[PDB]
Design a protein around this ligand. Structure first.
Ligand SMILES: COc1ccc(C[C@@H]2NC(=O)/C=C/C[C@@H]([C@H](C)[C@H]3O[C@@H]3c3ccccc3)OC(=O)[C@H](CC(C)C)OC(=O)[C@H](C)CNC2=O)cc1Cl
Ligand SMILES: Nc1nc2c(ncn2[C@@H]2O[C@H](COP(=O)(O)OP(=O)(O)OP(=O)(O)O)[C@@H](O)[C@H]2O)c(=O)[nH]1
Ligand SMILES: Nc1nc2c(ncn2[C@@H]2O[C@H](COP(=O)(O)OP(=O)(O)O)[C@@H](O)[C@H]2O)c(=O)[nH]1
Lengths: 427, 436
């Protein structure tokens, strides 16, 4: 039972992670009090990886929540699992998360992260075995990225023989405002690349473009985003939570998935996307499910995979259907869409099936891809930063608290390097 | 708790300080005694107005601010005025020799021999307070005091307090009330030595205010009383955000962030719609949409410039009383319909809005007509180029004839230094020209 320590920080990170944890607990059926009220014994067979044990035999999920605005538990209790997290490790800041990198990444907050690292180190050893670390946040500026990549650097320092993972969200100038973020993102990911190899780029722009246009919305609120993300990035780890064919561990997930030590930006999707409606819907069929699988609109990234090629694909079906027939349409897709995949990497279709269905849904399937497609999103975020770097806007605070211009230029150089790598490996 | 300190240098500065401070004391329900609004009456308040006034034992709400000039002409003239006991006696400094329109006089002759006392007093005042945020500067370009002493003082402040922001309320000078022809010289000599220390500056234009007091306020010979009262009203209409409640543009840092892209360029335009004159009873009525759409008109723009011919960079507003957001958004949408306004090609340029729950308070015995609606646009329009280039042109006309140079030279300036400053501000004009 290789346990996982969950790291989590930031206003958006906590918002997404609360609903994610609620979804996973509900699917596993443990009561919001913290006791097993599930409906079978296939739940607690090895699930200690996410849920530890208390003295009174009640379970206890392990996940750290930190920030720099003092009120987090005041906002963490906004759902249904406030006291559920152990009530001694809600380390809180003092100021807030203005969109200022290095205001958490160099001087203040960095003072707090030493104690944070001490606490997480103390937290880790109690388990029987360690799997690694995985982190949920957004690349959003304002203590959201600083603390994130900072703690990434120190955890990678302390445990080189484990695996990182980021559930970060790329900001976008369609849903949001306070436009200094391109700096924050394109600078933090600049060392996220060297510091981590396991990433999911849930494009907020794509989430809006699919949630407001063709999902019957008028003003997408933050809970609206939280529904879709707490669906997809909660179903992404069912393979970890549930035994099955592709039980691959973090290290093994990587070795099956990441060819090169940098080209590791997975772009996920989820075929039965659903806005918040209590009624489930009419039923869907397996070929329809696996066809909405590659729905370009369905993609949680900013591209249509038809416009590019894949490298290493996974898939996790869920429900009760034809177990052994899924290979038929897997090979059908392979045969009719050879151009979509690449010849450099044969048999890039690792597939598996999980018996359990999700909450409020019978037939569904979480998806993971790895394609050249995210070159489009990176070109977007690179132009949406370079077209404004010429005016040197707002770099006063950054240049005052400990950055410099050469750092900005070298970050742009690194990201042009990544887009070049994607381009050439597409060529 | 938080707090802020407003400095007052120069005759014009201290006149506007008296007018503004009396208006502010009136507005909050405070009185020339400051008995009590509704609070603990000793170390009370707890609303935003405490950031200006602090209660003594009597709950007097003493305004922790000082007034400075180099001649006991005006300082005393108001020290025995209406607010004799409002401020602390022996907390208003009086110089001896007037700077006499000589920038070097305030920079290396007399202000340099007294600035230590001012520094001691302001540092003691800061020790008295606990929640200092920054500084509010009331000075003028033309005067020797309000330029040289201003620059040297703020240099000392930036040396010792290198973190807090600061806001400058200067007065752009006009020929029609000009009391010198060395006025562009002092203006350049001070402003060329501000950017390195200045954070944001609200400069007001004498000719603009004069045209406001006449063409709409029904005056023909406005004294310093009329112009000063009107500019005190507009300054209150600006700072009401800091005065009352959490809304758009609460903090000085928030001010500059919402306003200042690039540190060198921190001169934002300002407007305030109600300039309706006086006891003239009623020719029409008021409306939120009316005043909001008429705000864009060049009528009330604090400094004479042509905004419609220049690309914008941001837009903030503020409203007094009669709150309802819906018609405010409707008015924004109506004015949003891109008649000729433009914006920045690389960032969102929304019309940020923060409303306030109190109608404007008018002086009990003055010209302004009571109203209840208001707007206050702190537009960061690039079109202040025109005015700066006009002042620079008026400057370099008189440099081929080496006019008046010796007068500044005699106290420790340099002749070629003026050329360096002129090139600095030619480059600043180029910087405005860059945005296109
Ligand atoms: C053309 O100029 C413009 C002016 C305004 C706008 C819109 C305007 N803003 C920006 O894109 C400016 C971003 C900068 C950023 C700088 C680079 C980071 O170090 C900052 C910092 C943070 C905390 C403490 C100390 C320093 O600051 C800020 O984080 C603050 C927020 C608060 C905390 C003051 O600023 C805003 O965001 C304001 C208040 C919210 N509103 C806006 O949507 C657009 C343009 Cl293009
Ligand atoms: N609006 C307004 N402008 C004023 C007032 N007093 C002076 N000015 C203008 O400010 C500029 C110069 O300021 P002054 O007050 O004359 O000069 P000073 O600061 O006393 O400087 P010195 O005479 O050198 O000590 C001129 O353009 C004046 O017309 C006033 O009360 N209100
Ligand atoms: N995906 C997602 N993005 C959000 C949410 N709320 C805000 N955002 C945007 O994504 C970024 C959030 O990260 P961050 O800036 O660290 O949030 P902060 O801690 O509130 O400053 C910001 O640029 C926001 O504009 C949310 O609930 N989900």
């Amino acid at each position: 039972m290789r346990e996982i320590v969950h790291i989590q920080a930031g206003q958006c990170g906590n918002q997404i992670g609360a609903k994610f944890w609620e979804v996973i607990s509900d699917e596993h059926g443990i009561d919001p009090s913290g006791n097993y009220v599930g409906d079978s014994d296939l739940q607690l067979e090895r699930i200690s990886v996410y849920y530890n044990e208390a003295s009174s035999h009640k379970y206890v999920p392990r996940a750290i929540l930190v920030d720099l605005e003092p009120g987090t538990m005041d906002s963490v209790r906004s759902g249904a699992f406030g006291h559920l997290f152990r009530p001694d490790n809600f380390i809180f800041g003092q100021s807030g998360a203005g969109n200022n990198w290095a205001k958490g990444h160099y001087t203040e907050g960095a003072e707090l992260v030493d104690s944070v690292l001490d606490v997480v180190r103390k937290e880790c050893e109690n388990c029987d075995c360690l799997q690694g670390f995985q982190l949920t946040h957004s690349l959003g500026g304002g203590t959201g990225s600083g603390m994130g990549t900072l703690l990434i650097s120190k955890v990678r320092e302390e445990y080189p023989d484990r695996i990182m993972n980021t559930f970060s969200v790329v900001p976008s100038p369609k849903v949001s405002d306070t436009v200094v973020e391109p700096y924050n993102a394109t600078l933090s990911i600049h060392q996220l690349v060297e510091n981590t190899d396991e990433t999911y780029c849930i494009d907020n722009e794509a989430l809006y473009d699919i949630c407001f246009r063709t999902l019957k919305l008028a003003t997408p609120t933050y809970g609206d985003l939280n529904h879709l993300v707490s669906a997809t990035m909660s179903g992404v780890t069912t393979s970890l939570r549930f035994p099955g064919q592709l039980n691959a561990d973090l290290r093994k997930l990587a070795v099956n998935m990441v060819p090169f030590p940098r080209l590791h930006f997975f772009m996920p999707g989820f075929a039965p996307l659903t806005a918040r409606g209590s009624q489930q819907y009419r039923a869907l069929t397996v070929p329809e499910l696996t066809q909405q699988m590659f729905d370009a609109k369905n993609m949680m990234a900013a591209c249509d995979p038809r416009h590019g090629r894949y490298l290493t694909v996974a898939t996790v079906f869920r429900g009760r259907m034809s177990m052994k027939e899924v290979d038929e349409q897997m090979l059908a897709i392979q045969s009719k869409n050879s151009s979509y995949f690449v010849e450099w990497i044969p048999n890039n279709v690792k597939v598996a099936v999980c018996d359990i269905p999700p909450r409020g849904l019978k037939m569904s399937s979480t998806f993971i891809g790895n394609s050249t497609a995210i070159q489009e999103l990176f070109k977007r975020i690179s132009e949406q930063f370079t077209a404004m770097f010429r005016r040197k806007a707002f770099l006063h605070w950054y240049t005052g608290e400990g950055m410099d211009e050469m750092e900005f230029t070298e970050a742009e150089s690194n990201m042009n390097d990544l887009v070049s790598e994607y381009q050439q490996y597409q060529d | 708790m938080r707090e802020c300190i407003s400095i007052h240098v120069g005759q014009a500065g201290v006149q506007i300080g008296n007018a503004c401070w009396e208006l502010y004391c009136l507005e909050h329900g405070i009185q020339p005694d400051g008995q009590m609004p509704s609070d603990k009456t000793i170390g009370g308040g707890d609303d935003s107005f405490n950031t200006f006034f602090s209660e003594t034992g009597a709950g007097k709400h003493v305004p922790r601010a000082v007034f400075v000039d180099l001649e006991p002409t005006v300082i005393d003239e108001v020290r025995t005025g209406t607010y004799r006991q409002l401020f602390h006696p022996e907390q208003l400094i009086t110089g001896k020799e007037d700077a006499a329109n000589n920038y070097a006089r305030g920079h290396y002759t007399i202000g340099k021999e007294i600035i230590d006392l001012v520094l001691d007093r302001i540092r003691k005042l800061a020790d008295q307070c606990t929640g200092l945020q920054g500084f509010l500067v009331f000075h003028s370009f033309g005067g020797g005091t309000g330029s040289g002493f201003t620059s040297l003082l703020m240099e000392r402040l930036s040396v010792d307090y290198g973190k807090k922001s600061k806001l400058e309320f200067s007065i752009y000078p006009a020929p029609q009330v000009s009391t010198a022809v060395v006025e562009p010289y002092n203006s350049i000599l001070t402003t060329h030595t501000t950017l390195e220390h200045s954070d944001c500056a609200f400069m007001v234009d004498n000719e603009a205010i004069y045209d406001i007091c006449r063409r709409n306020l029904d005056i023909e010979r406005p004294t310093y009383t009329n112009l000063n009262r009107l500019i005190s009203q507009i300054v209150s209409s600006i700072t009401a955000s800091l005065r009352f409640d959490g809304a758009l543009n609460v903090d000085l840092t928030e001010f500059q962030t919402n306003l200042v892209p690039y540190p060198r360029i921190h001169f934002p335009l300002a407007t305030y719609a109600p300039v309706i004159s006086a006891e003239k009873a009623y020719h029409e009525q008021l409306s939120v949409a009316e005043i909001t759409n008429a705000c864009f008109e060049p009528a009330n723009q604090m400094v004479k410039c042509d905004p419609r011919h220049g690309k914008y960079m941001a837009c903030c507003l503020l409203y007094r009383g009669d709150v309802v957001p819906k018609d405010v958004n409707a008015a924004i949408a109506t004015i949003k319909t891109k008649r000729s306004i433009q914006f920045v090609d690389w960032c969102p340029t929304g019309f940020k809005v923060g409303i306030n729950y109190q109608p404007p308070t008018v002086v009990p015995g003055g010209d302004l007509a009571k109203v209840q609606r208001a707007v206050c646009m702190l537009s960061n329009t690039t079109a202040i180029a025109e005015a700066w280039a006009r002042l620079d042109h008026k400057f370099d006309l008189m440099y081929a004839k080496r006019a008046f140079v010796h007068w500044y030279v005699g106290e420790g300036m340099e002749e070629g230094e003026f050329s360096e400053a002129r090139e600095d501000m030619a480059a600043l004009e180029k910087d405005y020209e860059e945005v296109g």
